[PDB]
Amino acid sequence: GRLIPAGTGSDFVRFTQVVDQKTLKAIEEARKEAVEA
């Protein structure tokens, strides 16, 4: 009753994320913040 090995359940696509350029600059701002003192 597990997800099918074949299809959208492909190891090649089971993992794929999406972004808005707005959330793109938001995460890099998180990286900028990493600079200590």
């Binding site: 090649f12 993992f15 794929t16 999406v18 808005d20 959330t23 793109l24 995460i27």
Partner: protein, 95 residues
């Protein structure tokens, strides 16, 4: 059929990839608040009992209507797994 399904198919390396993108984008569109869109202003999503589709009818019909534009970005490993859901909650209200 559906709007620029070919155009869509063409923007992906695999057919089954397009389907995961749209679905995951539809996911976030509702969870973090439905105004998490990139193309609302002038010509946008619309239904006719009123022009009320502007708020919440079909999730992915939006997802696709955005992906068809070149604003979104879908990668294999674009932004680290857990930090994504955090930054998204911080910036998008509506709950």
């Amino acid at each position: 059929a559906e709007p620029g399904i070919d155009k869509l198919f063409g923007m992906v390396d695999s057919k089954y990839r397009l389907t995961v993108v749209v679905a995951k984008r539809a996911q976030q569109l509702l969870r973090h608040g439905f105004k998490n869109t990139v193309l609302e202003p002038e010509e946008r999503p619309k239904m006719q009992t009123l022009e009320g589709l502007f708020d919440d009818p079909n999730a992915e019909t939006w997802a696709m209507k955005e992906l068809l534009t070149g604003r979104l970005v879908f990668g294999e490993n674009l932004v680290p797994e857990d930090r994504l859901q955090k930054e998204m909650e911080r910036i998008y209200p509506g709950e």
